[PDB]
Design a protein around this ligand. Structure first.
Ligand code: HEM
Ligand code: HEM
Ligand SMILES: C[C@H](O)[C@H](O)[C@H]1CNc2nc(N)[nH]c(=O)c2N1
Ligand SMILES: C[C@H](O)[C@H](O)[C@H]1CNc2nc(N)[nH]c(=O)c2N1
Ligand SMILES: NCCN[C@@H]1CNC[C@@H]1Cc1cccc(N)n1
Ligand SMILES: NCCN[C@@H]1CNC[C@@H]1Cc1cccc(N)n1
Ligand SMILES: [Zn+2]
Lengths: 411, 407
């Protein structure tokens, strides 16, 4: 079967054959689309086929499908599973696996960069302190003094699901959120619950507006432990506006390294519950969402007052006007401090090229329109006008329940 | 069986049960989502009719009554006998209002029940059609205080006597391809504009030439007609700060009136059912004005603002976008022609969704289309999970008539 996607701004049409290798479910039926819904220990039995599919892709990718090296590996993995109930990946496969999990991330607009990924093998890690060490090296390497580099650290895979390695933070770096008894919130509201957990665990919260949270790390299924990231390692950018001098007085700043740490990495059946990864920000993640979501820093009004926009009627589009300036400010600061960052125009255009390429050389590019289109100026970026097909391929990054909801404390 | 939708900005969760009555297909499978794709017999008819009437009677608290039963056999006999049937006025109105109610891609459905329905089923010719459309345009324009309406022409019989309005909207601007390789006017209508000429229209070859209606009756050949100029209310666009704005020479009509869709009620098909409401700002300012393939005026507005268009990171395109949309809302209000801004429009839709969940158990909604093409995440709907599915009565797309007309 062939599927066509059309771009209504250029009439360009594309054919997807890749979806034919899609095994996982989407959440949608013939009678219902769930395209806008955010969140919709294996047996020997299911494991080998999953291992086999993966290794087949792997060997085809290196042009050795059906080779003796290939057949031997299948046999090797086969035996190991029957003997130990699981199996270890060779460095080449882990690496090849992680890049493809990224390459298959249908909600990621930055995928043109998928083949350039530094993979750190942290499978020999056994303790939280061990984890902390690994993470610091990742932050330092990835930050690279502002000239950011994509990277991922992969800790030991799940075994019996009782010895999981988990990074309790959602991102390696995030500001604390504190709930005041008066109902207002200090810091980033999105992190209040986790901050509470950190405090309860012994963290001495400075209680400011931009407190870098401590790392809460679980190793081998044990209770998590706290670590403070060396300050000198946390690159941060003060936010100012190129024409507005009062902007700097808003006291805004942001860290430079976006590093998602709560996702699970699935490769050839194996589950890597702790696999932090980082790239570099697209302007809008900070300027639109982080600052302007009503449930985040909500700086839209304060910025509007200072600009003195007509805030009596929404039809003045004061909210729209302020949003643009704020985003202009984020891009400006980052470029000025020489910290890697990309604007949504550049990013979406690049993605469109990446996408087309993917159809030509791979027969498709799974993409989630709801997430690929930026949270501002949607239709003046090329992706808006691009039809897409969303389906799931492995390797892949999956959501996993927050560890505090499932962890069996040992005390 | 019972699905929940969460608003990630307010944490509110709603339970949708209405989707279980869904009947048509979505285009998706459990393997692939097609949510961003723009266009994904007597034995057949009675069940469709039955489904409709039951819901009609259910709505008027008389489900399973004699009237219900009676009507049910009357239509039943008529279908067998006449191989089709006619709807009672009451059913027509209810049908239309509900087709709008079920339009998962329309952000303005909170207004659904306030719909003026014009029964144009006694129509027999293109002239009659032209007469009906003019009355509709006039009644809905209402000197600027817009009122929603739909005029329903005769239903389909054997596909060989279909009534069709060839335009995509009652009111649109022409598009001509110049030697310059460039395009004059609205590129979206380039082709339709040609078909007009190929039929006689005297294109004034202007930038904003209100096109002529091209009407088709009882399967006959489409005929041309020029809506009375005094009936097409227009708004010249000026910015409330940039006096130079007026020099781009921009104007837009006040009446958004989709004419190419197909209205389906109780199995019956109304192939010519033009309908209208009023614009949400972004429709003109963002899509019509800035879409690269439309009037594509961003670069121009950019130059006038003297913005550094050297690099994309200056967000010049974004700054222009906002102004171009401030001007639209501005001009319309100034001339007192009804118009809603995307913040107000989406906010109304959230409340509507909530009323629909608690008073109907759901609200089909298409996120990709509901979220405005600008400032997406600052509008509430961006944070609103939606369930998309198809309910009848409904408005469906249909092949342009020229790619199907046996002259
Ligand atoms: C090189 C810089 C990169 C850029 C500019 C980029 C951009 C983005 C953006 C804008 C999002 C959506 C943000 C949000 O709303 O949460 C995103 C999501 C995502 N990206 Fe990337 N990305 C990059 C690198 C990476 C890397 C290195 C990986 C993995 C190896 C990755 C994996 C994903 C995944 C899994 C998601 C969706 C996460 C979710 O479902 O919540 N990205 N990316
Ligand atoms: C009264 C104010 C109304 C507002 C603000 C409103 C707004 C909108 C908007 C923004 C769209 C998307 C338009 C596009 O991007 O092409 C839409 C689509 C639509 N609306 Fe409404 N609408 C209104 C009235 C109506 C009426 C009176 C009907 C029907 C009786 C209706 C039926 C639909 C349908 C069927 C679509 C989708 C058409 C398609 O698939 O292209 N709307 N509406
Ligand atoms: C409910 C809705 O799906 C939700 O707001 C989605 C929409 N699109 C998004 N797109 C991106 N990139 N990131 C997000 O967090 C979201 N949130
Ligand atoms: C390809 C994609 O489906 C297309 O660009 C959609 C996106 N969302 C839209 N939303 C609205 N309201 N109107 C449109 O025409 C579109 N176009
Ligand atoms: N809701 C998921 C949270 N994702 C957060 C939102 N902003 C950074 C991170 C995504 C991400 C991952 C990798 C690179 C990047 N630019 N962005
Ligand atoms: N491309 C499908 C046709 N959509 C066109 C785009 N703008 C007017 C009309 C939608 C529409 C119908 C009713 C009211 C409204 N504001 N908008
Ligand atoms: Zn879907």
């Amino acid at each position: 079967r062939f599927l066509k996607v059309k771009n209504w701004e250029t009439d360009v049409v594309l054919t997807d054959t890749l979806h034919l290798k899609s095994t996982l479910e989407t959440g949608c039926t013939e009678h219902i689309c769930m395209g806008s819904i955010v969140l919709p220990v294996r047996t020997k039995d299911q494991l080998f086929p999953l291992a086999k599919e993966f290794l087949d892709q792997y060997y085809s990718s290196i042009k050795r499908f059906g080779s003796k090296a290939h057949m031997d590996r299948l046999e090797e993995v086969n035996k190991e599973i029957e003997s130990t109930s699981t199996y270890q990946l060779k460095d080449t496969e882990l690496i090849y696996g992680a890049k493809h999990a990224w390459r298959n991330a249908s909600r990621c607009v930055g995928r043109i960069q998928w083949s350039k990924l530094q993979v750190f093998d942290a499978r020999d890690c056994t303790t939280a302190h061990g984890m902390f060490n690994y993470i610091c090296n990742h932050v330092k390497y990835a930050t690279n003094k502002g000239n950011l580099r994509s990277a991922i650290t992969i800790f030991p895979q799940r075994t019996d699901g009782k010895h999981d390695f988990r990074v309790w933070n959602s991102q390696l770096i995030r500001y604390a959120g504190y709930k005041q008894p008066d109902g207002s919130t200090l810091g980033d509201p999105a992190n209040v619950q986790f901050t509470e957990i950190c405090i309860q665990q012994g963290w001495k919260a400075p209680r400011g507006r931009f407190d870098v949270l401590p790392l809460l790390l679980q190793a081998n299924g044990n209770d998590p432990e706290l670590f403070q990231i060396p300050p000198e390692l946390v690159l941060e950018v003060p936010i100012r506006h190129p024409k507005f001098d009062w902007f700097k007085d808003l006291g805004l700043k942001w860290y430079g390294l976006p590093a998602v740490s709560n996702m699970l990495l699935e490769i050839g059946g194996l589950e890597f519950s702790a696999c932090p990864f980082s790239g570099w920000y697209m302007g809008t993640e900070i300027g639109v969402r982080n600052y302007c979501d009503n449930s985040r820093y909500n700086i839209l009004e304060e910025v509007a007052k200072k600009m003195d926009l007509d805030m009596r009627k929404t039809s003045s589009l004061w909210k729209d006007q302020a949003l643009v300036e704020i985003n202009i400010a984020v891009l400006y600061s980052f470029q000025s401090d020489k910290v890697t960052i990309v604007d949504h125009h550049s990013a979406t255009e690049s993605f469109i090229k990446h996408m087309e390429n993917e159809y030509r050389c791979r027969g498709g590019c799974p993409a989630d329109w709801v997430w690929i289109v930026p949270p501002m100026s949607g239709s003046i970026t090329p992706v808006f006008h691009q039809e897409m097909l969303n389906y799931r391929l492995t390797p892949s990054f999956e959501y996993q329940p927050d560890p505090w909801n499932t962890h069996v404390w040992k005390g």
